[PDB]
Scaffold this active site. Structure first.
Site, PDB file in Angstrom:
ATOM      1  CG  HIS A 176      12.727  23.488  72.123  1.00 35.34           C
ATOM      2  ND1 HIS A 176      11.654  22.803  72.651  1.00 35.34           N
ATOM      3  CD2 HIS A 176      12.269  24.099  71.002  1.00 35.34           C
ATOM      4  CE1 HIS A 176      10.585  23.014  71.899  1.00 35.34           C
ATOM      5  NE2 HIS A 176      10.932  23.800  70.894  1.00 35.34           N
ATOM      6  N   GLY A 185       6.239  26.417  65.130  1.00 35.44           N
ATOM      7  CA  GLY A 185       5.950  27.642  65.846  1.00 35.44           C
ATOM      8  C   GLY A 185       4.926  27.505  66.957  1.00 35.44           C
ATOM      9  CB  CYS A 242       7.018  24.974  70.912  1.00 35.04           C
ATOM     10  SG  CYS A 242       7.239  23.288  70.246  1.00 35.04           S
TER      11      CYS A 242
HETATM   12  C1  LIG Z   1       7.989  23.706  68.646  1.00 33.38           C
HETATM   13  O1  LIG Z   1       7.197  24.676  67.979  1.00 33.38           O
HETATM   14  C2  LIG Z   1       7.910  22.436  67.716  1.00 33.38           C
HETATM   15  C3  LIG Z   1       6.465  21.836  67.249  1.00 33.38           C
HETATM   16  C4  LIG Z   1       6.552  20.746  66.363  1.00 33.38           C
HETATM   17  C5  LIG Z   1       6.951  21.194  65.097  1.00 33.38           C
HETATM   18  C6  LIG Z   1       6.088  20.522  64.163  1.00 33.38           C
HETATM   19  N1  LIG Z   1       5.086  20.110  64.882  1.00 33.38           N
HETATM   20  C7  LIG Z   1       5.256  20.251  66.127  1.00 33.38           C
HETATM   21  O2  LIG Z   1       4.498  19.874  66.855  1.00 33.38           O
HETATM   22  N2  LIG Z   1       8.712  21.420  68.341  1.00 33.38           N
HETATM   23  C8  LIG Z   1       9.852  20.991  67.805  1.00 33.38           C
HETATM   24  O3  LIG Z   1      10.179  21.410  66.801  1.00 33.38           O
HETATM   25  C9  LIG Z   1      10.682  19.869  68.486  1.00 33.38           C
HETATM   26  C10 LIG Z   1      11.887  20.433  69.246  1.00 33.38           C
HETATM   27  C11 LIG Z   1      12.842  19.438  69.968  1.00 33.38           C
HETATM   28  C12 LIG Z   1      13.946  20.071  70.662  1.00 33.38           C
HETATM   29  C13 LIG Z   1      12.178  18.526  70.846  1.00 33.38           C
HETATM   30  N3  LIG Z   1      11.075  18.986  67.525  1.00 33.38           N
HETATM   31  C14 LIG Z   1      10.200  18.110  67.029  1.00 33.38           C
HETATM   32  O4  LIG Z   1       9.108  18.055  67.389  1.00 33.38           O
HETATM   33  O5  LIG Z   1      10.689  17.305  66.103  1.00 33.38           O
HETATM   34  C15 LIG Z   1       9.928  16.410  65.523  1.00 33.38           C
HETATM   35  C16 LIG Z   1       9.351  16.885  64.235  1.00 33.38           C
HETATM   36  C17 LIG Z   1       8.646  15.949  63.413  1.00 33.38           C
HETATM   37  C18 LIG Z   1       9.396  14.643  63.166  1.00 33.38           C
HETATM   38  C19 LIG Z   1       8.612  13.597  62.365  1.00 33.38           C
HETATM   39  C20 LIG Z   1       9.304  12.294  62.191  1.00 33.38           C
HETATM   40  C21 LIG Z   1       8.187  14.067  61.039  1.00 33.38           C
HETATM   41  C22 LIG Z   1       9.956  14.143  64.473  1.00 33.38           C
HETATM   42  C23 LIG Z   1      10.644  15.174  65.283  1.00 33.38           C
END
Ligand SMILES: *[C@H](O)[C@H](C[C@@H]1CCNC1=O)NC(=O)[C@H](CC(C)C)NC(=O)O[C@H]1CC[C@H](C(C)C)CC1
Lengths: 298, 296
Positions: free
Chosen positions: B43, B142, B144
């Site tokens: 992604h 960040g 990931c």
């Molecule tokens: C990549 O760095 C990132 C890590 C997450 C961000 C916050 N904490 C993490 O672990 N991944 C993503 O951003 C990911 C990408 C998609 C294409 C899969 N999106 C993701 O994880 O979304 C989630 C964020 C938190 C929410 C919660 C309901 C608050 C759910 C979706």
């Protein structure tokens, strides 16, 4: 909701490159190789039989430079030997080409640091610990772990703050700062020594309650407040450290909008138990997370 | 008496040396640099605008090697997609590539995570792959591309590349064959997480630690067989107990048999009735047989 508040260590690669093995006679343990110096605990000089009241001043005099073998795994030529408190300062003829920028700073109670556990100069594991108010740490240390080092990192600068020496009867551990002093003034003799009574680290409990607030769990916040000086007078008599605020605590107060004084009141109400409720999955107060941990992880 | 039983991570130096930053257009995250290959989550190709339902096959086709920038705190000359991961070929070989393998961890198993931001390693912690194929840990924006690994000797088994956070604050990622643990989709959409379970073999290991620590009040001559326990476990939110040499080692150290402790789990699941085991009033299931053998 999982807070994401976990025991986190610093990456250990910088310290791994400095670990060596030091042998003196039968005794072997770990050393720390910085530039042309190798640090290790001085009881490496003691033979097992005489470990219960060693004369260290006389043992040192009886040594030559050849009395010390220093090996890197993860030989070195010892060209000087000296003693600094409970540590040996060995001089070697090759400067560690991977020496990190570093400082030697004693840590105080409530501060967290990473430990790199090593056996025969080979790093085996890393964990984080908190220097307790009775100058002990928990963690995992077996036979052969002495000379394992504890450290923090601020920027490019590693701060070396611990070198492992001993285990106590209750299973906890202690060691030296790199100025040579033993934490808690324990002696590096093989004799029963009883640690002092422990205490709750008030500033860390505050951080943990701020973490709870940031995670959505704030049932325990009331308008009521207890001033710092009033909390500290109450602290002396109920097994809590004095509370000293930091810019790191203050960031958390600003983010949450809950003031320190409200959490000090809360602590006076909570240390007896949570009357059926939980905070961050726990039913007792947690004091091994620091304000800095909470600012970084949440 | 402090048992000495703690969350212990593997020394991270070997892995720190493989971490790079990967940039694609206006997104950045971490990647793993082994030989001439840089691994990272696919992604990184997605504009922030379009994270809900990305078309990964169209995004891949729209890229060129010059789409991707690799910085090591490196020129890309190849790019392919494997499952939920990118396999980028760069021109310089990582000289400090450790001996390694690729393994898919099973529930109950522990691994170490090197959490990285912008290619810079920042922290290390140990997690347990839960029976619902999620992990806890600490992962912010960040993170990931952060990798999880075990060690068998000097050999590193890379088992995890971080991908996402679920609604309840837990996390999941890919194995290096490109599959998401638990078959979660790498898209930013609500997804149903299965309820967690107790890892019985780890609960057993914790009770053995207690006995070795001199806490054995819960040890009775009563025994439950594995198959009765397993039948009980299905209905009581526990995993199948599977014996191992690691476990057997502990029954031999203590002289307490697995079946004595299986019996014990059935009683202690109702509560300890005013007593404590290793400072706890609930069963603990995130220390493995291997942890206990090695730390006690
Ligand atoms: C990549 O760095 C990132 C890590 C997450 C961000 C916050 N904490 C993490 O672990 N991944 C993503 O951003 C990911 C990408 C998609 C294409 C899969 N999106 C993701 O994880 O979304 C989630 C964020 C938190 C929410 C919660 C309901 C608050 C759910 C979706």
């Amino acid at each position: 909701h999982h807070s994401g508040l976990v025991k986190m260590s610093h990456p250990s690669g910088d310290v791994e490159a400095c670990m060596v093995q030091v042998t003196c006679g039968s005794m072997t343990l770990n050393g720390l190789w910085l530039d042309n110096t190798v640090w290790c605990p001085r009881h490496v000089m003691c033979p097992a039989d005489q470990l219960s009241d060693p004369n260290y001043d006389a043992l040192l005099i009886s040594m030559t430079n050849h009395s010390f073998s220093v090996q890197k795994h993860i030989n070195l030529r010892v060209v000087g030997h000296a003693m600094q408190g409970t540590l040996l300062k060995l001089t070697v003829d090759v400067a560690n080409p991977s020496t990190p920028a570093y400082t030697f700073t004693t840590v105080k109670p409530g501060a967290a640091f990473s430990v790199l556990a090593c056996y025969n100069g080979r790093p085996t594991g890393t964990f984080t610990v908190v220097m307790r108010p009775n100058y002990t740490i928990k963690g995992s240390f077996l036979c052969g772990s002495c000379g394992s080092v504890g450290y923090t990192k601020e920027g490019s600068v590693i701060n070396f703050c611990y070198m492992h020496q001993m285990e106590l009867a209750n299973g906890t551990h202690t060691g030296s700062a790199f100025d040579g002093t033993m934490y808690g003034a324990f002696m590096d003799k093989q004799v029963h020594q009883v640690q002092l009574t422990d205490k709750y680290c008030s500033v860390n409990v505050v951080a943990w309650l701020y973490a709870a607030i940031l995670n959505g769990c704030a049932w325990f916040v009331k308008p009521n407040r207890t001033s710092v000086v009033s909390f500290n007078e109450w602290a002396l008599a109920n097994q809590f450290t004095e509370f000293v605020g930091t810019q790191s605590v203050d960031m958390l107060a600003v983010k949450t909008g809950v003031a320190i004084e409200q959490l000090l009141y809360a602590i006076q109400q909570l240390y007896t138990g949570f009357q059926g409720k939980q905070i961050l999955g726990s039913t007792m107060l947690e004091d091994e997370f620091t304000p800095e941990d909470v600012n970084m992880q949440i």
